[PDB]
Design an enzyme around this catalytic site. Sequence first.
Site, PDB file in Angstrom:
ATOM      1  N   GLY A   1       3.027   8.092   3.538  1.00  0.00           N
ATOM      2  CA  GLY A   1       3.973   6.993   3.548  1.00  0.00           C
ATOM      3  C   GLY A   1       3.511   5.735   2.835  1.00  0.00           C
ATOM      4  O   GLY A   1       2.729   5.769   1.867  1.00  0.00           O
ATOM      5  N   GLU A   2       4.005   4.615   3.345  1.00  0.00           N
ATOM      6  CA  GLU A   2       3.895   3.354   2.663  1.00  0.00           C
ATOM      7  C   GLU A   2       3.678   2.220   3.664  1.00  0.00           C
ATOM      8  O   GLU A   2       3.950   2.387   4.842  1.00  0.00           O
ATOM      9  CB  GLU A   2       5.141   3.138   1.799  1.00  0.00           C
ATOM     10  N   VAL A   3       3.164   1.084   3.186  1.00  0.00           N
ATOM     11  CA  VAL A   3       2.969  -0.113   4.004  1.00  0.00           C
ATOM     12  C   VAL A   3       3.676  -1.346   3.474  1.00  0.00           C
ATOM     13  O   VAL A   3       3.717  -1.629   2.278  1.00  0.00           O
ATOM     14  CB  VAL A   3       1.505  -0.441   4.097  1.00  0.00           C
TER      15      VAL A   3
ATOM     16  N   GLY B   1       0.853  -1.183   0.000  1.00  0.00           N
ATOM     17  CA  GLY B   1       0.000   0.000   0.000  1.00  0.00           C
ATOM     18  C   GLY B   1       0.892   1.238   0.000  1.00  0.00           C
ATOM     19  O   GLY B   1       1.974   1.207   0.589  1.00  0.00           O
ATOM     20  N   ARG B   2       0.454   2.301  -0.684  1.00  0.00           N
ATOM     21  CA  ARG B   2       1.096   3.633  -0.676  1.00  0.00           C
ATOM     22  C   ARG B   2      -0.040   4.615  -0.442  1.00  0.00           C
ATOM     23  O   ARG B   2      -1.132   4.407  -0.952  1.00  0.00           O
ATOM     24  CB  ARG B   2       1.772   3.952  -2.014  1.00  0.00           C
ATOM     25  N   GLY B   3       0.172   5.675   0.325  1.00  0.00           N
ATOM     26  CA  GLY B   3      -0.947   6.594   0.581  1.00  0.00           C
ATOM     27  C   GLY B   3      -0.859   7.412   1.850  1.00  0.00           C
ATOM     28  O   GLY B   3      -0.193   7.012   2.816  1.00  0.00           O
ATOM     29  N   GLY B   4      -1.550   8.549   1.857  1.00  0.00           N
ATOM     30  CA  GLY B   4      -1.312   9.564   2.865  1.00  0.00           C
ATOM     31  C   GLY B   4       0.165   9.933   2.864  1.00  0.00           C
ATOM     32  O   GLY B   4       0.715  10.331   1.822  1.00  0.00           O
TER      33      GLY B   4
ATOM     34  N   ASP C   1     -14.274   7.929   8.115  1.00  0.00           N
ATOM     35  CA  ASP C   1     -13.793   7.926   6.733  1.00  0.00           C
ATOM     36  C   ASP C   1     -14.149   6.586   6.115  1.00  0.00           C
ATOM     37  O   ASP C   1     -13.313   5.924   5.523  1.00  0.00           O
ATOM     38  CB  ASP C   1     -12.287   8.217   6.668  1.00  0.00           C
TER      39      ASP C   1
ATOM     40  N   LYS D   1       3.386   0.065   8.728  1.00  0.00           N
ATOM     41  CA  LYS D   1       2.934   1.280   8.130  1.00  0.00           C
ATOM     42  C   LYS D   1       3.870   2.308   8.630  1.00  0.00           C
ATOM     43  O   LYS D   1       3.931   2.564   9.832  1.00  0.00           O
ATOM     44  CB  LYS D   1       1.514   1.602   8.549  1.00  0.00           C
TER      45      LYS D   1
END
EC number: 2.7.11.15
Lengths: 339, 62, 625
Positions: free
Chosen positions: C174-176, C169-172, C288, C191
């Site tokens: 940073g990354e996971v 995952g990538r988002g906000g 959200d 995360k």
Amino acid sequence: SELDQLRQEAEQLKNQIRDARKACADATLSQITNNIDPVGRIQMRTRRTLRGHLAKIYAMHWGTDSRLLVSASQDGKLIIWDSYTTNKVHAIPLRSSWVMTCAYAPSGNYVACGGLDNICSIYNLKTREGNVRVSRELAGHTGYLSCCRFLDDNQIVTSSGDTTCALWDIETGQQTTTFTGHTGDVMSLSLAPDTRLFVSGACDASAKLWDVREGMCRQTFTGHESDINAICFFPNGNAFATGSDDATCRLFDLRADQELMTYSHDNIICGITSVSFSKSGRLLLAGYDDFNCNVWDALKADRAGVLAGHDNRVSCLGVTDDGMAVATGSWDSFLKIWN
Amino acid sequence: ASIAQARKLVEQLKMEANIDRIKVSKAAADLMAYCEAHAKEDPLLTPVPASENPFREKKFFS
Amino acid sequence: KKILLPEPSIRSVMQKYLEDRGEVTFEKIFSQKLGYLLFRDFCLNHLEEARPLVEFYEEIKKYEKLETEEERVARSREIFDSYIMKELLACSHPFSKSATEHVQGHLGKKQVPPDLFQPYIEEICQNLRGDVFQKFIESDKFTRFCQWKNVELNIHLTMNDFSVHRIIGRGGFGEVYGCRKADTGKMYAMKCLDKKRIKMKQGETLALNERIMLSLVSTGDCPFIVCMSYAFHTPDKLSFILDLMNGGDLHYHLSQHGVFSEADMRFYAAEIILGLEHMHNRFVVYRDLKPANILLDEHGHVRISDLGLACDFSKKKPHASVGTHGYMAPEVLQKGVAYDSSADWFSLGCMLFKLLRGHSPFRQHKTKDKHEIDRMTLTMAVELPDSFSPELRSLLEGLLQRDVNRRLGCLGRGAQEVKESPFFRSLDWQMVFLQKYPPPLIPPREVNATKGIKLLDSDQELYRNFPLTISERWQQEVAETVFDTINAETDRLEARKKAKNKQLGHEEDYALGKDCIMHGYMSKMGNPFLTQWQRRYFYLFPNRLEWRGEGEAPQSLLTMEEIQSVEETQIKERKCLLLKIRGGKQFILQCDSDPELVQWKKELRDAYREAQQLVQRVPKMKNKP
Ligand SMILES: CC1=C(C(=O)Nc2ccc3n[nH]cc3c2)[C@H](c2ccc(F)cc2)NC(=O)N1
């Protein structure tokens, strides 16, 4: 009122005693002994240095055999030493760390120590299988134990910060007799050689004579300006010496019921921790807080010699029954032997 | 505060006050006499030879 | 790599350490996974009085988990007969008058809740508390508990404790990453938020809050929410260790599957409801809610993820306007307008529509206008497509109600209300919870689903309360992985060293029968310039501190009189203790773990202080002039 009147007449009895005392002060001991020859200088040197305790030594005692001697230290142990070889016959870890005093019994079969535990613990040295149990824990004082001495294997006398001393029966555990009168922490005692009498010294700066069998106080010796930390009988049992926070030692005679001699110099400011007499009574040995033991002429009050290898306070001392030797014990963690 | 305890003080002061005292000169002489009488059997006072001293050059014990 | 346990000697210090925090109680210990497992290994195996009392506890537990009545009626006969009626005939039942009768009534009437045995639970516990507890504390099972507790309490994670894999995952900010915790071999997600890429957006609050929010929720094990076991940071990143979900998000699956049927959406709805129930029980509106924030595990089961914008209504209720546009309830959007859980019901409503029809309901003609998607939410009932069943309609009706007076979930009993929606008539929610329903989408096996900036003193202070470990998660991790196999090796290792001392002769510990307060291993420092640190066994007494090496008695000590101060100090970045001594001298000691340091300090300070007030009162002992 009766509460007034009994204070009034204690004041008046106090005067009766001071007067009765002065009526016997026809001479001094110094006058009397002006004639005899001085002792010269007493010159002893360290024979043995006893190494083992890991902290301060607070107290020691010799066995009657003039050879073994027991000591107590802030390291929470007693050690029983053979002075002759420096070997450790025993090494006893105590149940309470806060030990202050110790004793060796006449027979050398038991020892005893105590401290802030408020108990005199008797340790049987010679067990069913060569071990060292606590044989007894004499409880009953309501303050720290300050000194103790066996009369023999079955009885013992203690002194306490609760301001009393006491006679115990070891087999039963009982506080046989108690000895009240002192108005402050009792700090030391000594048994007369005949064991019918002992004296105590205390933080009230009085010192007192007591009859064991009767449980009473015969006589009370004032004169020091400060705490009496230490006390020892003259070998004939007719007098005793005290050592105090006022930097003086004093000699009191019993039958004359008063002081005979003060021991001191303007050069000595610290308090005395301990005192003993040479075998003849002629020397008076005292341990000081300035690290040195001073050896005084008991009869002429002059200052004969000094024992001085110790890097902290000399806290205790004793002379052998055979008179051959003096042990000194220090806050610097060692005992030394002097002869 | 206590009447018991004052009675008790006084009786003690009576014991102390009614003893037979002796002259200090007699007292002190009796003491001086003790010291002479035992002066010879006191090792700290007199110089003994090594061979009567447990601690000097001595090796051998029990 | 692997977890090494501290020696048994460590018991002296942890026991005082826990005792100071009241944590040596039946209650506190029994209710921890490892405490539980150690207590029971004790009772069942090494104490005959206690075995039954615990088998009985356990059987009841298996009985609370029985799924039916027909399963129930049966086992509760055996349980009665076996652990009670046997005893009764031998006079020996150590329980109440009432309890006993309260069960036998439910039997002859064959009306058998999952709680029948609850009057007994209380009493088994009274029966175990106190006295039996006491022997367990004396037993070396409690010593073993102290060893695991010590490891727990000394956790200090770093990237290095982790074997880190592909990005999932990538988002906000940073990354996971998928990752494996080396200790135990547990797979987790990681995360990673770049502190800088945060400052740039003054996003710090959000980053922090997630952490706060994760901690309220990550207890209980919820299968339908992504939960946290550790948090830690480095100077550049924040890290959260999280439940692994490598299946991608709905937003992405949706885009690949296309829209879901009512049946397939019913499955996700149900898991999502249950997730919401959890959070709402702990006063947390998620806010959200949307396909991109719902995640798939390897099998297609789902979890609510990413709690940044989520917040707590325990003490005071938010009125602020946050969420993703096209899923926010009216009360939210309206500023000056407070609220609770409600938004999540609406958002659910919004979201479910989306899975059926490819768009947010209030996002027709692929518009972006942010102000008017809001309009459609206020005074406006949404028109629900001809193809939607009667029961789907009543559901969405319930969930999209302009007013909270009349929305489904906001009328008294949360969650439950929506579960009784006849849209879900077909489902059994115990079976939903156990994740027994086959999911409609199985992710195939991978998914794919500037700097001038600086970092001051007062940046990292924002992050000072960030690291954290969740006791419940850690114990669980360990309990499922290495605990049996380590207890084993440890057991064997200790019995070597001990049985070898039956030869050597180091055979009568020095603390016993004295006044020792504490003892243990520490390293004192000899010559700094040689990294000389000699490790000794220390014993603390009320008036000195003794120590020694292997074989000897103590040769050396320090007295409490001699100690002036005790302080914490930094040496080549490990924490030591600094005892200053009267000669203007120093004495440094390094501990092997946090609690050991924490304790040696409290006790050294206590002891020097008391001993000095003591000696002060004793005329023979004090220093005079
Ligand atoms: C819910 C969401 C993201 C996300 O949180 N993905 C996650 C989160 C936790 C996970 N655990 N195991 C796989 C995971 C994948 C992902 C994301 C979010 C924040 C990040 F810092 C990194 C990736 N991008 C996105 O649009 N939405």
